[PDB]
Structure 1
Amino acid sequence: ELVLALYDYQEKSPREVTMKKGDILTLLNSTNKDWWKVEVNDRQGFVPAAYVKKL
Protein backbone atom coordinates (compact mmCIF):
# COMPACT_ATOMS: atom_id res chain seq x y z
CA GLU A 1 0.00 0.00 0.00
CA LEU A 2 1.16 3.50 -0.97
CA VAL A 3 -0.04 6.83 0.45
CA LEU A 4 0.39 10.38 -0.87
CA ALA A 5 1.60 13.13 1.53
CA LEU A 6 -1.00 15.92 1.35
CA TYR A 7 1.04 18.30 3.58
CA ASP A 8 4.56 18.75 4.87
CA TYR A 9 5.04 17.18 8.27
CA GLN A 10 8.15 17.67 10.41
CA GLU A 11 8.79 15.01 13.04
CA LYS A 12 8.21 16.14 16.62
CA SER A 13 9.04 13.01 18.59
CA PRO A 14 11.38 9.98 18.37
CA ARG A 15 8.71 7.74 16.83
CA GLU A 16 7.79 10.18 14.02
CA VAL A 17 9.17 10.68 10.51
CA THR A 18 9.34 13.79 8.28
CA MET A 19 7.58 13.99 4.89
CA LYS A 20 7.17 16.61 2.21
CA LYS A 21 3.91 17.34 0.36
CA GLY A 22 3.77 15.18 -2.78
CA ASP A 23 5.92 12.35 -1.30
CA ILE A 24 4.77 8.83 -2.04
CA LEU A 25 5.17 6.74 1.15
CA THR A 26 4.94 3.04 1.78
CA LEU A 27 2.16 2.33 4.29
CA LEU A 28 3.25 -0.20 6.96
CA ASN A 29 0.50 0.01 9.57
CA SER A 30 -2.86 1.78 9.54
CA THR A 31 -4.55 0.19 12.53
CA ASN A 32 -4.50 3.39 14.59
CA LYS A 33 -7.05 5.99 13.56
CA ASP A 34 -4.80 8.98 14.25
CA TRP A 35 -1.20 7.92 13.50
CA TRP A 36 -0.07 5.71 10.59
CA LYS A 37 3.32 3.99 10.32
CA VAL A 38 4.99 4.66 6.97
CA GLU A 39 8.37 4.21 5.32
CA VAL A 40 9.93 7.38 3.86
CA ASN A 41 12.94 6.43 1.85
CA ASP A 42 15.06 4.57 4.42
CA ARG A 43 13.24 5.62 7.61
CA GLN A 44 10.10 4.14 9.29
CA GLY A 45 7.83 5.94 11.73
CA PHE A 46 4.54 7.67 12.34
CA VAL A 47 2.78 10.57 10.61
CA PRO A 48 -0.75 11.89 11.23
CA ALA A 49 -3.26 9.78 9.28
CA ALA A 50 -5.21 12.88 8.24
CA TYR A 51 -2.18 14.20 6.33
CA VAL A 52 -1.99 11.27 3.87
CA LYS A 53 -4.26 9.82 1.28
CA LYS A 54 -4.30 6.10 0.41
CA LEU A 55 -3.81 5.46 -3.33
Structure 2
Amino acid sequence: MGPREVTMKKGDILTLLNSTNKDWWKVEVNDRQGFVPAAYVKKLDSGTGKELVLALYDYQE
Protein backbone atom coordinates (compact mmCIF):
# COMPACT_ATOMS: atom_id res chain seq x y z
CA MET A 1 0.00 0.00 0.00
CA GLY A 2 1.06 3.56 -0.65
CA PRO A 3 1.37 4.37 -4.39
CA ARG A 4 4.79 3.66 -5.92
CA GLU A 5 6.28 3.84 -9.42
CA VAL A 6 5.18 0.69 -11.28
CA THR A 7 5.83 -0.36 -14.88
CA MET A 8 4.31 -3.01 -17.13
CA LYS A 9 5.10 -4.84 -20.35
CA LYS A 10 2.47 -5.61 -22.99
CA GLY A 11 0.97 -8.93 -22.04
CA ASP A 12 1.37 -8.75 -18.28
CA ILE A 13 -1.66 -9.80 -16.22
CA LEU A 14 -1.98 -7.59 -13.14
CA THR A 15 -4.14 -7.86 -10.06
CA LEU A 16 -6.59 -4.93 -10.09
CA LEU A 17 -6.95 -3.19 -6.74
CA ASN A 18 -9.07 -0.12 -7.50
CA SER A 19 -10.86 0.89 -10.68
CA THR A 20 -13.15 3.57 -9.27
CA ASN A 21 -11.37 6.21 -11.35
CA LYS A 22 -12.14 6.18 -15.08
CA ASP A 23 -8.62 7.14 -16.14
CA TRP A 24 -6.21 5.67 -13.57
CA TRP A 25 -6.43 2.25 -11.98
CA LYS A 26 -4.51 0.99 -8.95
CA VAL A 27 -2.83 -2.35 -9.49
CA GLU A 28 -0.35 -4.68 -7.84
CA VAL A 29 2.85 -5.09 -9.88
CA ASN A 30 5.20 -7.66 -8.32
CA ASP A 31 5.09 -6.78 -4.60
CA ARG A 32 4.48 -3.07 -5.25
CA GLN A 33 1.28 -1.01 -5.76
CA GLY A 34 0.76 1.78 -8.26
CA PHE A 35 -1.34 3.46 -10.92
CA VAL A 36 -1.51 2.62 -14.60
CA PRO A 37 -3.67 4.14 -17.35
CA ALA A 38 -7.11 2.50 -17.58
CA ALA A 39 -6.84 2.80 -21.38
CA TYR A 40 -3.74 0.61 -21.39
CA VAL A 41 -5.43 -2.40 -19.72
CA LYS A 42 -8.52 -4.57 -20.06
CA LYS A 43 -10.51 -6.20 -17.22
CA LEU A 44 -10.45 -9.94 -17.72
CA ASP A 45 -13.31 -12.41 -17.38
CA SER A 46 -11.77 -14.94 -14.97
CA GLY A 47 -9.27 -15.44 -12.18
CA THR A 48 -12.55 -15.36 -10.27
CA GLY A 49 -12.86 -13.52 -7.00
CA LYS A 50 -9.57 -11.80 -7.70
CA GLU A 51 -9.69 -8.91 -10.19
CA LEU A 52 -7.34 -9.18 -13.17
CA VAL A 53 -6.34 -6.90 -16.02
CA LEU A 54 -4.32 -7.52 -19.17
CA ALA A 55 -1.72 -4.90 -20.19
CA LEU A 56 -2.37 -3.85 -23.78
CA TYR A 57 0.73 -1.61 -24.15
CA ASP A 58 4.00 -1.08 -22.30
CA TYR A 59 3.95 1.58 -19.60
CA GLN A 60 6.49 3.39 -17.44
CA GLU A 61 6.47 6.85 -15.93
Q: Specify which of 25, 36, 41 is matched with residue 30 of structure 2.
A: 41
* Poorly superposed stretches of 4+, deviation over 3 Å: none
Give the strand-richer structure, 1 or 2: 1
Q: 1:44 Cα shift?
A: 0.4
Higher Rg of the two aligned structures: 2
The percent of aligned pairs where both chains have the same amino acid is: 100
What is the alpha-carbon root mean square deviation over aligned residues? 1.4
2:4–2:32 CA contact under 8 A, matched in 1? no
TM-score, L = length of structure 2: 0.63
Q: 1:41 Cα shift?
A: 1.1
1:22 lines up with 2:7 in the alignment: no
